[PDB]
């Protein structure tokens, strides 16, 4: 899967 996300969902 490939998708953009928030910096928050990053960690």
């Amino acid at each position: 899967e490939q998708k953009l996300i928030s910096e928050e969902d990053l960690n």
């Epitope: 899967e1 490939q2 998708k3 953009l4 996300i5 928030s6 910096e7 928050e8 969902d9 990053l10 960690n11």
Partner: antibody, heavy 127, light 112 residues
Framework: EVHLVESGGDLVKPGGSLKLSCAAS????????MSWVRQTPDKRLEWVAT????????HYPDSVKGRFTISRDNDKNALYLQMNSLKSEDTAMYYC????????????????????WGQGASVTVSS | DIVLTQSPASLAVSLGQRATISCRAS??????????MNWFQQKPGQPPKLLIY???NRGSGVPARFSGSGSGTDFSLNIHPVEEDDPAMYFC?????????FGGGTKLEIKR
């Protein structure tokens, strides 16, 4: 849904200063890192600034390094861009944008994908 | 700095035809298995719009007519078929490192 509205655009004589603001709405502002990108008459887009979600990390291109400073007030859902020592070269259309990072096959990476932009704020530096 | 060179500068394509814009990079944009290549669409009087991210991923609300390809230092945007709504400016941005530079831009016009 996602809405970013800019303001503060105006004429400024060289060596002056201006503070652009960007009203954010329709998403949890505090979870994303915002940015500012300007476009000159020659149409070329130039990334100018970017701040982290919490507002602790920030960075700029050698272009406006030292004259510009990005800031944010998550309680007021707003992004700001303070400009000082304005050259005529800085005249352009200033846009603010949301940034999204990347989910690549089971892991996460800082990407800096500007997925949403405000209408823009025209800025002219002329005597 | 890593500058991108976009070619052609402008382009005229008939309705239903294919439009192929290219973007070449100075250094390699590859990393972790992907590339920090991004395409934007800017229609006159409007703020650029995100079309593709990470080489081939479509932005939200971007029809399959748009696709990205390429690796390393060479990438391209493909539009097939081209529709009335497409005449605009197209830039290719890189984000593998600061500064994150945009390509020169390619103007796309409907040939009629």
């Amino acid at each position: 849904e996602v809405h970013l509205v800019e303001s503060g655009g105006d004429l400024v004589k060289p060596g002056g200063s201006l503070k652009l603001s960007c009203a954010a709405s329709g998403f949890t502002f505090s979870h994303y890192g915002m940015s500012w990108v300007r476009q000159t008459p020659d149409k070329r887009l130039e990334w100018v600034a970017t701040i982290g979600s919490r507002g602790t990390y920030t960075h700029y291109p050698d272009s406006v390094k030292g004259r510009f400073t990005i800031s944010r007030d998550n309680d007021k859902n707003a992004l700001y861009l303070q400009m000082n020592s304005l050259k005529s070269e800085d005249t352009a259309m200033y846009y603010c944008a949301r940034r999204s990072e990347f989910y690549y096959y089971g892991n996460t990476y800082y990407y800096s994908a500007m997925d949403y932009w405000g209408q823009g704020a025209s800025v002219t530096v002329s005597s | 700095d890593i500058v991108l060179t976009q070619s052609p500068a402008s382009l005229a394509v008939s309705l239903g035809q294919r439009a192929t814009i290219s973007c070449r990079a100075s250094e390699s944009v590859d990393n972790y298995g992907f590339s920090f290549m991004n395409w934007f669409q800017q229609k006159p009087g409007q703020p650029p719009k995100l079309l593709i991210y990470a080489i081939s991923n479509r932005g939200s609300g971007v029809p399959a007519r748009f696709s990205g390809s390429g690796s390393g230092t060479d990438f391209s945007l493909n539009i097939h078929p081209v529709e009335e709504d497409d005449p605009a400016m197209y830039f290719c941005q890189q984000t593998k490192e600061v500064p994150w530079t945009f390509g020169g831009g390619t103007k796309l016009e409907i040939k009629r």
